[PDB]
């Protein structure tokens, strides 16, 4: 839980780079496993078919990358399709589908949390530089000057003068 | 010479203020504050902006390889069956809305097309997530 919340508080460029790299790594990771399924059944030599394939038009590693980029972001081109006679491909497709719909969702949640947190802008209070001691109402009293910067109002503001001393 | 408005909208002419710069984070917060008509207008325009911008680069990258010319079977097109700028626009909007048409798909032998394809998905998800957060 702690290591997950750490990335939530990162700045805009860091989260953009992390999110972009995570999607690219996920896309690249599926390209490797999809290429493995090709290496098993669909060889580089086409052989004029002679064997029922399960991933059509997958002639090279780049084709597997195109299959991965189409299936994980739910585009679904038709030039390359998944077929039967490959139970591991069906299993990896279900695994790829569920992680996909979750990885964007958890990244989408970070944007929701980010836009809520980034709207704080709390360092908008104006004060003085020193302390003033003078007379008020006839008696010597301590005093200070406060101010606000935000266009809105500081609603239900409470003020405490906490004197710290070594006694 | 009033101090607080009787209606409630207490306005104060805050002057003699130092030069305060504005970053992009405040701009994002102001986008959230836009009302429904303003948000819908800027949302539709931004999506059309993204769609036509990606359409332009796809039409550019199609005319760069030579797919705009009539392929006589030999020249493998970076995007299949792309004929005119209208066809390129249809392909671009399909990628960025996760629709998927299949007929006018994208193939290998064009790494620049691959790079444009991957970056659109990343940027498309980012703007989609931003749009969802704004309206939410």
């Amino acid at each position: 839980q702690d290591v997950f919340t750490t990335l939530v508080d990162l700045k805009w460029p860091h989260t953009l780079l992390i999110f972009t790299m995570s999607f690219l790594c996920s896309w690249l990771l599926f390209a490797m496993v999809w290429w493995l399924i090709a290496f098993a059944h669909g060889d580089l030599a086409p052989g004029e078919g002679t064997n029922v394939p399960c991933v059509t038009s997958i002639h090279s590693f780049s084709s597997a990358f195109l299959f991965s980029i189409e299936v994980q972001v739910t585009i679904g081109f038709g030039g390359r399709m998944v077929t039967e006679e490959c139970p591991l491909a069906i299993l990896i497709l279900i695994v790829q589908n569920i992680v996909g719909l979750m990885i964007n969702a958890i990244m989408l949640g970070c944007i929701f949390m980010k836009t809520a947190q980034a709207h704080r802008r709390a360092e908008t209070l104006i004060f003085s530089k020193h302390a003033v001691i003078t007379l008020r109402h006839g008696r010597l009293c301590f005093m200070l000057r406060v101010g606000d910067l935000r266009k809105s109002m500081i609603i239900s503001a409470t003020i405490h003068m906490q004197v710290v001393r070594k006694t | 010479a009033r101090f607080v408005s009787k209606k409630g909208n207490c306005n104060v002419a805050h002057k003699n203020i130092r030069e305060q710069g504005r970053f992009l984070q405040d701009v994002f917060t102001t986008l959230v504050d836009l009302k429904w008509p303003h948000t819908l207008l800027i949302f539709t325009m931004s999506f059309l902006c993204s769609w036509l911008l990606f359409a332009m680069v796809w039409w550019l990258i199609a005319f760069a390889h030579g797919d705009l010319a009539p392929g006589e079977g030999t020249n493998v097109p970076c995007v299949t069956s792309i004929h005119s700028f209208s066809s390129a626009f249809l392909f671009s909007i399909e990628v960025q809305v996760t629709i998927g048409f299949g007929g006018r798909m994208v193939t290998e032998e064009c790494p620049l097309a691959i790079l444009i394809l991957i970056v659109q998905n990343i940027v498309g998800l980012m703007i989609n997530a931003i749009m969802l957060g704004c309206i939410f």
Binding site: K151 | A13, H14, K15, N16, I17, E19, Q20, G21, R22, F23, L24, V27, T30, L31, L34, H38, L41, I42, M45, S46, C49, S50, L52, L53, M56, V57, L60, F63, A64, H65, G66, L68, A69, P70, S84, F85
Partner: protein, 488 residues
């Protein structure tokens, strides 16, 4: 018949990519489109977002004075380029929109970049204009691609498109220079501590109404800022609550200080004639000659543009008088046609468009010259008025009999003499321009008609002494009426 970017001639054979992708004809035009459409779709959301502590500070980034005139001449040549493109495409069989649609988008790119600058200059935020910076380099890069592509084919100065491209690269280059200027000026994106600047005193002051001297150049030119004031005064009357303290420089105290500086300079220069008429003249000159010459130069430019008006309508009526009025597609390079100046200037459509743009510039610059002259006159008054006021405080009331008569004289003086001097200062730009204007006018009549117009111009100039004679007569009549009405 399709409607693609480039024409379908030879079954779209021009759409080939061999013999060099960049060397292709249709390709280089599309490359210029890319940076323009990039700016369009990167600025629209930011602009719609923006559409207290910021509305009261109309600040400006350095170089904006040059940027405004730079984009103005840029949009001028861009609409000219659209006119040049359509002229070349009309003779061709296919539509060939590739000659005026790219430049058509470039014009829309120029206008949107300017309003983005104004919308982002209302507040001190120089970090948002990096999109403009990354746009200008890409525009400059693709502009140079077109220039080098034309040089590789050696079209030359015959086709006006080559000259337009050769100047657009310099125009884009000047934009890059004035853009990187603000880097060294501010250091906002590539350094730690940005050298931020504060708004002027007049802008920061709470009560200020005449903010024209410190406003964007578009408003400074066409008085667009007055719209607000011109509307509010329709409902409520005008009092000393809307109007407020004049700007720091426009106030009479600063004008008085400048006058004393000029007097001290004139005294140290030639103290042989102290407080002489020529001494005051030279002091006023060296004090206000900067803006005085500025107004004169604007009026000279306005007069030159005003002459082009009739010089432009000459072509339109001449083109109609031409019997055949056929097109001139003879000149061509690499298949595609290219217009020439000897026929581009004669085409009716572009000539009317160019006249409209030239007349707009004219009718604008004329107003600037008069406004500067009027602005100098009021400032000169506020300075001259207090100069006499200081003399009144320091004068000696000797010769009471001679001093009494002068009391009425000095009151009448500050009333009519100061007012009459301002009229001279108001009309001084007109006095400076009238000789060269009339000289250019009579010369143009000769080249237009011949010896006939020479006699005509003489008859027109013959009315000048008649006006002078009746003016003396009217002055004599006015004196008699005033003398009689005084006793009446």
């Amino acid at each position: 018949m399709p409607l693609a970017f480039c024409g379908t001639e030879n079954h779209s054979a021009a759409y080939r990519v061999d013999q060099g992708v960049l060397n292709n004809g249709c390709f280089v035009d599309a490359l210029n489109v890319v940076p323009h459409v990039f700016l369009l779709f990167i600025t629209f959301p930011i602009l719609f977002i923006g559409w207290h502590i910021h509305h009261s500070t109309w600040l400006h980034f350095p170089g904006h004075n040059l940027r405004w005139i730079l984009t103005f001449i840029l949009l001028f040549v861009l609409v000219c380029e659209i006119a040049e493109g359509i002229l070349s495409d009309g003779v061709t069989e296919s539509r060939h929109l590739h000659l005026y649609m790219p430049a058509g988008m470039a014009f829309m790119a120029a206008i949107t970049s300017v309003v983005y600058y104004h919308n982002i200059e209302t507040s001190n935020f120089p970090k948002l204009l990096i999109a403009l910076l990354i746009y200008w380099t890409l525009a400059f890069i693709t502009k140079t691609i077109k220039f080098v592509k034309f040089y590789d084919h050696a079209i030359g100065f015959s086709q006006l498109r080559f000259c337009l491209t050769g100047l657009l690269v310099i125009l884009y280059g000047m934009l890059l220079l004035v853009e990187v200027n603000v880097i060294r000026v501010r250091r906002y994106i590539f350094f730690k501590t940005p050298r931020e600047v504060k708004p002027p005193e007049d802008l920061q002051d709470l009560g200020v109404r005449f903010l024209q001297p410190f406003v964007n150049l578009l408003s400074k030119g066409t008085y667009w800022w007055m719209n607000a004031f011109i509307k509010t005064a329709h409902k409520k009357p005008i009092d000393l609550r809307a109007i407020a303290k004049l700007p720091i420089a426009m106030r009479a105290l600063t004008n008085y200080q400048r006058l004393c500086v000029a007097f001290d300079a004139q005294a140290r220069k030639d103290t042989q004639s102290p407080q002489g008429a020529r001494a005051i003249w030279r002091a006023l000159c060296h004090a206000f000659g900067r803006r005085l010459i500025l107004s004169s130069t604007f009026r000279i430019l306005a007069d030159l543009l005003g002459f082009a008006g009739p010089l432009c309508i000459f072509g339109i009526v001449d083109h109609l008088g031409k019997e055949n009025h056929v097109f001139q597609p003879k000149t061509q390079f690499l298949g595609v046609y290219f217009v020439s100046s000897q026929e581009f200037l004669g085409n009716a459509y572009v000539l009317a468009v160019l006249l409209f743009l030239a007349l707009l510039l004219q009718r604008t610059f004329l107003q600037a010259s008069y406004y500067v002259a009027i602005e100098t006159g009021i400032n000169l008054r506020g300075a001259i008025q207090t100069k006499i006021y200081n003399k009144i405080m320091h004068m000696s009331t000797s010769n009471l009999s001679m001093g009494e008569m002068t009391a009425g004289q000095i009151c009448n003086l500050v009333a009519i003499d100061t007012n009459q001097l301002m009229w001279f200062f108001f009309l001084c730009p007109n006095l400076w321009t009238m000789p060269v204007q009339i000289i250019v006018g009579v010369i143009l009549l000769y080249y237009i008609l011949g010896v006939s117009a020479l006699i005509g111009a003489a008859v027109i100039i013959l009315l000048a002494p008649v006006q002078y004679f009746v003016a003396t007569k009217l002055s004599q009549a006015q004196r008699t009426t005033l003398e009689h009405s005084n006793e009446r």
